[PDB]
């Protein structure tokens, strides 16, 4: 029955700021403090800062003197973080935890939210530019053969490809979204045999909701 | 401003035990760093496992263990369980703030080990006719899921302007990730040599193009 609340997600403008909210619940407040916690996919954690609620005491880490700013509410029981001029190295998600009863460093990170995923750009909804990927004059005589297709330059997540809308889909493989300069690629490739293709041709169908676009690509050989 | 180091990755398998360490760039580990540990499980759940050192935290099974040996921090799985594949991270504390290790994955192998399928794949001139560049480097069906993709460009290395999607599960349990490695038009056809390199458990396996 302990338990802080973070909301989910958070969509904020480079330069701009923000501030998240723990709401703490379960337990006394005041005598347990509260840590915050970065973590950019693909990275580890990164120690922001932790609070004692009562009397305003804090330790900031060197690194985020200035972006982090940290505050209670005791009333409401809801802890604090202000960030300062986001930047789109701090798209990550971010946690509070709840450490030690009192000054001791004698517990633990106990409990945690389950994050802020805060998410850092200027862009506005763009269809993906979807190029295919044919191999390569490096010519497999062999039983199998991969083509695929990147889903370049869209915003915001997500899209979804399928392979002749569903025709092919043994050994379909979709990758993660990656963030790259404000707007999200991803790829898709998808295994065949050899005779198969260019035989018959190969199209991927790729959706993207937010832009009410949809579009194929023909994988053509080189 | 201390570098807290763990072991990468390990695999264990069921019942057997494991320990990883944690150990400081600033020498010896002391009892006033207070070394926690903190487990991470899919979807963001973490949990504390241990704090000042060896103290475990109350529902937490007796199978996790925390030490110091010598000079650095320590946790010892004895019962080793499916449960614990996760990824765990100690903490240290050096008189006014904590600091994270990079953590361990651990892998409690359940099926044999497979190696990668790495793919690349050359710019589409339809990318290219926008003044821009990207190589693609799909891994797939590979087990335990840890690798590291690097690449080079005209046999030096590079290390800005690519990116690897952390793995992911595959509907079979094995896993896949992706690299991309951009460059404007120019660039691209300034080189010749491009390579994708993934290795995984000590093998790395390889696939360049050339222009
Ligand atoms: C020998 C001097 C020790 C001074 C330590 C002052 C307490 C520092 C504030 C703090 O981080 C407490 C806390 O929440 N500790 C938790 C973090 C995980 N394990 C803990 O005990």
């Known amino acids: 029955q302990v338990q802080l609340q973070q909301s989910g997600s958070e969509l904020v403008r480079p330069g701009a700021s923000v501030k998240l909210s723990c709401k703490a619940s379960?337990?006394?407040?005041?005598?347990?403090?509260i840590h915050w916690v970065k973590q950019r996919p693909g990275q580890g954690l990164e120690w922001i800062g932790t609070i004692y609620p009562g009397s305003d005491n804090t330790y900031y880490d060197e690194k985020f003197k200035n972006k982090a700013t940290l505050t209670v509410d005791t009333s409401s029981s809801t802890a604090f973080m202000q960030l300062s001029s986001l930047t789109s190295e701090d798209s990550a998600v971010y946690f509070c935890?709840?450490?030690?009863?009192?000054?001791?460093?004698?517990?633990?990170?106990?409990?945690w939210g389950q994050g802020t995923l805060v998410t850092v750009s200027a862009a506005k909804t763009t269809p993906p530019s979807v190029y295919p990927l044919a191999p390569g004059s490096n010519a497999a005589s062999q039983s199998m053969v991969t083509l695929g297709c990147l889903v370049k330059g869209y915003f915001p997540e997500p899209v979804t490809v399928t392979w002749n809308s569903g025709s092919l889909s043994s050994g379909v493989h979709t990758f993660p979204a990656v963030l790259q300069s404000d707007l999200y690629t991803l790829t898709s490739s998808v295994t065949v045999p050899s005779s198969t293709w260019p035989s018959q041709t190969v199209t991927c169908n790729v959706a993207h909701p937010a832009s009410s676009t949809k579009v194929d690509k023909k994988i053509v050989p080189r | 401003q201390a570098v807290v180091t763990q072991e990468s990755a390990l695999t264990t398998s069921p019942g057997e035990t494991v320990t990883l360490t944690c150990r400081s760039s600033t020498g010896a580990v002391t009892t006033r760093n207070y070394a926690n540990w903190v487990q991470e499980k899919p979807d963001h759940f973490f949990t504390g496992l241990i704090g000042?050192?060896?103290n475990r935290a109350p529902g937490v099974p007796a199978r996790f263990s925390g030490s110091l040996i010598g000079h650095k921090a320590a946790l010892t799985i004895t019962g080793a369980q499916t449960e614990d594949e996760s990824v765990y991270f100690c903490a240290l504390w050096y008189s006014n703030h904590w600091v994270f290790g990079g953590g361990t994955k651990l892998t409690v192998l359940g099926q044999p080990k497979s190696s990668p399928s790495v793919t690349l794949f050359p710019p589409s001139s339809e990318e290219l006719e926008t003044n821009k560049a990207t190589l693609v480097c799909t891994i797939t069906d590979f087990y335990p899921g840890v690798v590291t993709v690097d690449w080079k460009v005209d046999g030096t290395p590079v290390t800005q302007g690519m990116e690897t999607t952390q793995p992911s599960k595959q509907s079979n349990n094995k896993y896949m990730a992706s690299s991309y490695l951009t460059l404007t038009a120019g660039a691209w056809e300034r080189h010749s040599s491009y390579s994708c390199q993934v290795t995984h458990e000590g093998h790395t396996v390889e696939k360049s193009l050339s222009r």
């Open positions: 000042d050192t060896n």
């Open positions: 379960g337990y006394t407040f005041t005598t347990y403090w």
């Open positions: 935890t709840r450490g030690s009863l009192y000054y001791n460093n004698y517990g633990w990170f106990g409990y």
